[PDB]
Design a protein around this ligand. Structure first.
Ligand SMILES: *Cc1c(COP(=O)(O)O)cnc(C)c1O
Ligand SMILES: *Cc1c(COP(=O)(O)O)cnc(C)c1O
Ligand SMILES: *Cc1c(COP(=O)(O)O)cnc(C)c1O
Ligand SMILES: *Cc1c(COP(=O)(O)O)cnc(C)c1O
Ligand code: NA
Ligand code: NA
Ligand code: NA
Ligand code: NA
Ligand code: NA
Ligand code: NA
Ligand code: NA
Ligand code: NA
Lengths: 380, 380, 380, 380
């Protein structure tokens, strides 16, 4: 029924055999056959299918209102699997500020295989319409994007993809299925780095893919079985476990996000703030129309590099580390940690200023997170 | 010093911090930074590197006398990573009877990316010389092959690859580093499905890659980090653990292999036997020159399908399942389980007769394995 | 600072060595010594101490405002360890309706070792004063108790224990350290079945003990090292992980508890309801004075056995299984599942009627849990 | 049939449901009931029984030719469970040089519960007959003992126990079920620290108990369920896995033991050597009559403390750490590491000289182990 209930009872996460209320961890590679070709429960070799992996796949398919789920050894393995739906000579459109790892996979690996890539500003969907070529086969968007939280209209992107015969893909990592369900808006494929919010505990690297399209699912299954970027059973188990608390975690994160943004906007040491909840944010109305909550990633400007470092040093409850979606709040400086290879003037033109700070809000107490960040900013 | 000692003390498989005599399982995705860019022990994000995965990589690099190791979520993920060293328009030579999964990856996935593939009978290395094109960039061989145990000269293949500027690759799964070290014979890259003998307990799906070439290692690391088919920490731990007993397991397996082959050759219900230890086997001398032991996979002919099924039904200690390299002895019928899609007349011409049985010898008692198989064959 | 922050940052749950943001799983039994007697980080043998177990011990000590934590293979192993502080001839007072497993350990195991036991109604603390003998050494109370949620005054019990020289012990399982901290009220030892709320995911059997008393801690450590009921590293890791979300889980559970109790009190098919939040509940004021929240266990009366079974059959979201503190809501019938050995007339006199149902509220949506239970009760 | 086959196929270590060829890891605490009291496969609560633990219990029961197996969180938890079969006022006879942990449990924990203990030299079984009191209920022996490898006649001890109505117990850790089966010689209960040879990889702390007596098994099950020192599922899985290679590991260890003893006896820097294979060893004939192999623990005398430390420093392949039964060879000095609390003159009288070294032989190459130890001794 409601979302928090679906999180607990959706998918198959018990043992039909013993009745165990959690998914058994099938730390196994192969399965007895009673007769040649006779599989007891459809399992024959763990790369092809493993019952613990099957549990997490059924969870993600249920949570995204899809029919088929796929678990990969990482988010970028999920993305590579989806890209391998294309052939040499095919063209893919992606949002301009797509995740660094995605950019690098496409432009340094798959272009060597003749996949062509155009990055376009998808915040105006007619940009997509202009970028479509006769060879375009896929449209791939994140929304909201990193680290400036740009919002793209999912439903219009799906309509455009249908009209021009494109496979539409949404990287739904930042929003999670708790707040945004692209398959319900006509998208063909949805994917996640489950490394972030879904696992939620910074202890699994994993990717998840869901679709309702039987033919795309057959192609993804063939690619998964042939190139073998499968999630293992222990990690699939930890994923199922972490997803149980997704709704509670996201709701705590959203309460803190709202309060922290109020604080950041009022603070004299903070200039611009980037988050889709701000009503002056580009495509705020679009986000509210396609999601019923918010990501916990916020970016905001302080004065300069030394201000950003001082902020990090002065906070008690914000931890300096890579990734997002932990139970801890995480803090980072994109210009030094994710965009340092880009020339400084291009960074500045892009908005990746030296004093741009990104925080991933965790599940600590809201008052503590607000007060800690505020007192740290007061030291500037 | 000697091999069984190297298996125990080779690589880094203890904890420098606590002194734990086994590798800690770093079930974690990210790492604290003391200052932006300052990594305590070189770790920053588990997809890029994880200390448990690093342990298993150092083991495989040590055991194959390489410098760099890489752990993937499966053998075919290792193979796909190695193939992605090539570009659209490049050509790869492989041995004709290469593993089904490898064949399928190359001909159904990578040909869509403009990689060209020729299967040649590498049991005569001048076949390789004839198949070389101006676009050939890689030579990929298994030895011995499945299920007919064809043997290819590793050292001559490495010489050919060097002369013509090819990346040489050996799939060393069937022999393990305990018996055959292709890097010592001039091969550029060696790889394994660690799912089989290395893990040795049918409870991990994993691939392992080793090289001594710094530039190839940098390219493999980039591909691993970008396409993300990484082995997880729990599976890396189980791999290290299983490798500890590799030498003891392989030696038990070899004792049983020798005795079982004597029995099969004497038995009137058995026709041809396929294994490199048989002195009439093609390239027996080559195998003995490049390896100091044997694989546990044996194929042999009984009369027909019903004879093969009866054999399976009558054995007490041979288990019907996919894969090989378990502690259990495994039995299968290729014509029904791995080559059933190939037309029957082409199967027969290839030697995959209806009564061709493959066994993967386990570590049960040698007398029990010989007597069990013999009494089962007596029922024919 | 506040509780939800303490849950995330309290205790030592990162790796000082690599910076891993989660506790490494030290699946190891022994540790290298650089010189005889020189331990690198104080570890020498995992039964005596294991770094993952040490992490969960530091968490429980922090959350209960104690100084020392101890992790056992189960709640009843924790209880047996605490009882083994006593000698033959010593006497222990426990609350009359103490947990079945505790009752059975004391009366069927430890009485054979000359420990004497008296069960008294501790809802009046002068009952304790009357039951004290010259040989009494320990006072052991749960509050609230199972399944009728009887409340005992913790602070008065601690005062009584101090005056008469007793070791005071509170089984704090039902309330968790999120809502009730007995060590702050003068109790000597606090313990939990971490199997329930603390792990929170029905996938670990474990017990946890905390104290601020150095001498009691030394005695507990000696008993743990000598009788060896230690929690393993994988289970300690899963405990730390589950505790991260304790506050969010307990708060969701409490919201649902309040709404479900309103529904049960209004429903004509329900008679008596047992829970400390009801203002007519015995010692309601005491509970509110010693806790700032509620347990998720509720008991209530329907008409008879068949009514109770019908309730179970008609609910969509209440799962029939043993234990409590899961993310799922659990339902059971004490008279059939925990008190079936007690004669029926004594059960009735005790309030364990045939139609007494116990539910352990999970983290499903509050409206769904209320509506599901209400429609099921409507079918009566 | 033969032992190495029994190791692979004995016990239930596959999944009847999916056919998985390894035991699933049931990381779970509780089980769905289809109707109140109706258990699908007999599981209801993991402390009482867990399917992974059940797998390892069936293995140990099979390997010791018993009917019932029990897995505990440690060897000393197994021992405490067995001791709790007795009551206050009961008396137990143990061999004089029993393991330190056992001595400490009995004399510092269970004597406080009125269990009486006598340590007697059981190398002469009439010592047992003399020590029997009217209150004696249990006879507990290790053979061979630590660190001087004293041998006790198992079959005569069982006869004595039967005649006088004693529960007979053998701690079979040092020999493993691969070489010595006390239940076959009339002993009531056999137990192991599975931490050592059975797990075999220094990564599990665990105890195992087997019996053929239904009534003793019912009592042990009650004690296990009531005091809760149960092995967890992940550790039970690793135990099953490690036991697979027990036979191969023990046979390698025995080959090295024989060669190392030849070397030690010939070496001028070595005085007395302690091991049951030496024909001048007390009760050598008894050992050969009750076992068909040897433990890997050897003790031998060098001159003094500094000689012992120099030996440790000079060996390349012997690791300084506690415990035994690893794949690594381990080295230690009892007088400094296990008997340092005993006064020096009593140590000397007992044979625990300052230069007494204990090695636990691992599975490294035999020549390497012999040559490494010999060159280290040459440096004296
Ligand atoms: C409520 C519920 C659903 C319904 O999903 P929708 O969001 O309505 O599409 C599915 N599965 C479970 C377990 C549920 O509780
Ligand atoms: C013996 C040994 C080596 C030497 O390897 P080679 O086979 O001689 O190339 C390396 N590492 C360890 C731990 C060894 O024991
Ligand atoms: C707030 C906080 C504390 C303080 O605990 P009290 O409840 O005030 O006794 C301790 N540790 C951490 C990590 C905290 O955040
Ligand atoms: C051989 C065998 C047995 C027989 O055990 P004994 O040592 O003869 O008592 C039992 N189980 C299995 C699986 C065997 O292979
Ligand atoms: Na479900
Ligand atoms: Na659609
Ligand atoms: Na090493
Ligand atoms: Na080379
Ligand atoms: Na902390
Ligand atoms: Na106190
Ligand atoms: Na079996
Ligand atoms: Na007997």
């Amino acid at each position: 029924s409601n979302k928090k209930t679906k999180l607990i009872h959706g998918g198959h996460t018990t043992d039909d055999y013993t009745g165990a209320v959690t998914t058994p961890i099938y730390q196994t590679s192969t399965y007895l056959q009673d007769d040649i070709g006779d599989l007891r429960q459809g399992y024959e070799y763990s790369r092809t299918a493993n019952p613990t992996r099957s549990s997490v796949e059924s969870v993600i398919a249920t949570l995204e209102n899809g029919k088929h789920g796929f678990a990969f050894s990482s988010g970028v393995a999920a993305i590579s699997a989806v890209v391998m739906l294309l052939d040499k000579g095919d063209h893919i459109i992606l949002n301009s500020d797509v995740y660094g790892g995605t950019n690098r996979a496409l432009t340094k690996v798959f272009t060597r295989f003749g996949i062509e890539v155009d990055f376009v500003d998808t915040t105006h969907t007619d940009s997509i319409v202009q970028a479509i070529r006769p060879t375009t086969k896929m449209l791939f968007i994140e929304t909201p994007s990193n680290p400036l939280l740009r919002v793209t209209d999912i439903k219009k992107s799906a309509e455009i993809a249908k009209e021009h015969g494109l496979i539409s893909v949404v990287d739904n990592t930042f929003m999670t299925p708790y707040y945004q369900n692209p398959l319900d808006l006509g998208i063909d494929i949805v994917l996640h780095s489950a490394t972030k919010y879904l696992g939620g505990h910074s202890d699994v690297v994993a990717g998840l893919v869901a679709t309702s399209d039987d033919k795309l699912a057959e192609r993804l299954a063939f690619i998964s079985n042939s190139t073998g970027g499968i999630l293992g059973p222990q990690d699939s188990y930890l994923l199922v476990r972490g997803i149980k608390t997704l709704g509670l975690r996201m709701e705590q994160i959203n309460r803190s996000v709202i309060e922290i943004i109020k604080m950041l906007q009022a603070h004299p040491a903070v200039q611009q703030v980037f988050h889709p909840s701000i009503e002056s944010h580009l495509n705020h109305d679009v986000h509210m129309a396609q999601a019923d909550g918010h990501t916990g990633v916020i970016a905001f400007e302080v004065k300069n590099t030394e201000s950003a470092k001082q902020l990090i040093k002065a906070t008690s409850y914000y931890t300096l580390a890579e990734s997002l979606g932990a139970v801890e709040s995480l803090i980072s400086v994109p210009a030094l940690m994710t965009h340092a290879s880009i020339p400084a003037d291009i960074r500045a033109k892009e908005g990746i200023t030296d004093g741009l700070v990104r925080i991933s809000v965790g599940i600590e107490d809201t008052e503590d997170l607000v007060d800690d960040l505020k007192q740290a900013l007061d030291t500037l």
